[PDB]
Structure formats: structure tokens, C-alpha cells
């Protein structure tokens, strides 16, 4: 209930992420593929959807975009 301002690598919260996928194991790949994409962007080749920070790591962008709900996944 009371989030109490989380910071850094615990942001964004894991519970708000877990809700998007079926299980955390899905969320891992669901993020990691978006991380793989934003990795590709610097060289789909979609850009950073949520506002990218000063030197934010690909992982954090993916998790922020999953927290923003800007992606969908397909259970193989």
C-alpha cells in the first residue's frame, strides 16, 4: 500500500511489473527482449518509449516501459 519512495535498481517496483506478465519468468524475457531492442536502437529497432535518463541502463528503460504498460507479450 505505502510504497515509501523506492530508489535506484528497486525502481520500478517488481509487483507493478509482475502484474503485466503471467509470471516473473515471463517478465524476465518480456523485459530482456525490450532491453535487447533498446540495445539494437543505439546501432524491432524501436526507440526508448518512456523518457530516457542521463545514463539509464537498457534494463531499467524496459522495466519503466513495462511499468508504463507500453508493451505486450506473446506466450510461445
Amino acid at each position: 500500500s505505502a510504497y515509501d519512495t523506492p530508489l535506484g535498481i528497486t525502481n520500478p517496483p517488481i509487483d507493478e511489473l509482475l502484474s503485466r506478465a503471467s509470471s516473473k519468468y515471463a517478465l524476465v524475457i518480456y523485459a530482456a527482449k525490450r532491453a535487447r531492442q533498446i540495445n539494437d536502437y543505439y546501432n524491432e529497432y524501436v526507440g526508448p518509449l518512456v523518457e530516457p535518463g542521463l545514463q539509464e541502463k537498457p534494463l531499467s528503460i524496459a522495466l519503466r516501459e513495462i511499468h508504463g504498460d507500453l508493451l505486450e507479450h506473446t506466450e510461445g
Binding site: 519468468y25 530482456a32 535487447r36 539494437d40 543505439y42 546501432n43
Partner: protein
């Protein structure tokens, strides 16, 4: 205290050495694999047991990919499996890995 990003490898085994004198790595045991699998972190373990240790193309390709700042290449062909395949074929056991459907292949 001991650290190793990369360094000088052994000739006999193709995994980093042990000890601070030879600038070795640090031993990733079975019990760590058990825990990785208990987490269910296939990618971490499969990264630890391929490019981080064995695969000669793997280590240089991942170093190259890291310094270039590109996607990490998917670790394909571990040295251990080549060793065990060649070693089993040395004891006159024909081992061929079949796909779900179609014809079989060599690893390279």
C-alpha cells in the same frame, strides 16, 4: 582478494585458471548451478557455463560485443560438449543429436 574480468587462460582446459598468482578466475561450482536452477535463471547459468568459462569464440565475441557496446551474442557451442562428443566418439559410441522434425546436423 582476487578479481578477473578476462585474463590468461589454461592450455589443457579452456576455462579460466585458479589462484591469484596466475591471475585466475573464481570457481563456479555445482551447488551454485543448483541455486541458479532453483531460482530458474537458465540464461545466467547458461551464460556462466559457456562464454564466461569455456567457449573460445564466445569469450572474444562477448569481450568484442561489450567493448563495441552491442547485443551479447547467444552462446552456441560450449567446449565441454565438443570435448565430451569427441571423447564419446573416441570410445566408439555414435552420438547424433536429432531435431524435433527433419535431418540431424553437426554443431558447426
Amino acid at each position: 582478494i582476487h578479481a578477473r574480468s578476462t585474463g590468461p587462460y589454461s592450455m589443457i582446459t579452456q576455462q579460466p585458471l585458479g589462484g591469484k598468482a596466475q591471475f585466475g578466475g573464481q570457481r563456479f561450482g555445482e551447488m551454485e548451478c543448483w541455486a541458479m536452477q532453483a531460482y530458474g535463471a537458465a540464461y545466467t547459468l547458461q551464460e556462466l557455463l559457456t562464454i564466461k568459462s569455456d567457449d573460445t569464440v564466445g569469450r572474444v565475441k562477448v569481450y568484442e560485443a561489450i567493448v563495441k557496446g552491442e547485443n551479447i551474442p547467444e552462446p552456441g557451442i560450449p567446449e565441454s560438449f565438443k570435448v565430451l562428443l569427441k571423447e564419446l566418439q573416441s570410445l566408439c559410441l555414435n552420438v547424433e543429436v536429432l531435431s524435433s522434425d527433419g535431418a540431424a546436423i553437426e554443431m558447426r
